[PDB]
Amino acid sequence: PRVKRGVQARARHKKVLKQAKGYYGARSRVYRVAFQAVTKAGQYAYRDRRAKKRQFRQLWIARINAASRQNGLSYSRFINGLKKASIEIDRKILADIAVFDKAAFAVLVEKAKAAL
Template sequence: MARVKRSVNAQKKRRQTLERAAGYRGQRSRLYRKAKEQVTHSLVYSYRDRKAKKGDFRRLWIQRINAAVRAEGMTYNRFIQGLKAAGVEVDRKILAELAVHEPAAFSALVQTAKDNLPADVNAPKTESKDGAAA
């Protein structure tokens, strides 16, 4: 069998790995084995955090909406319930943008949600004169 020489390919692979590791501190940018480990970890972190970013932004939007809704005298949960009852299909990203940049429009949405909230099911029941719960 003929001898396989891969020096060009091996050097290219190592060079690419070290180029990817440029900017890392210490040996991680200079030594191939350390750089390879760090580049692999970096790719894992970036993949994982691209997925996590979606949840992070959703949590941020909910916090912003909650703060704006509480300023209007309502809770986030009741606000979302009222919007669903009203048939308003605006996602949380847009609601958060409205809360920050368009307070008047957001106040109108809060009022719409308040108007369409069902009666409070947890409110204490009042009794009528004949003793039956109303």
């Protein structure tokens, strides 16, 4: 039997085109360009799911360093202090505390200083 490809052929093309909504120009209109676009978006999305974890930790460390140095200790010394004090609060939390509860951060800094 002879198979016509139309109906399924369109469904594939449409799937990709729907994933390419919002891209500029051909990249949202034309299957050949959109496909390439939706692939590279997936590639970037894979790479960035990893690199998100790096970017966020850099941000926290930068913020903790700011707060520690306002409380008279370097980031490097503060982490050592906390380690020596057996305080296992993550950088994500520390950095949250540095913004939202400055006093608590200072306590932790004072604890850290004592351990050093």
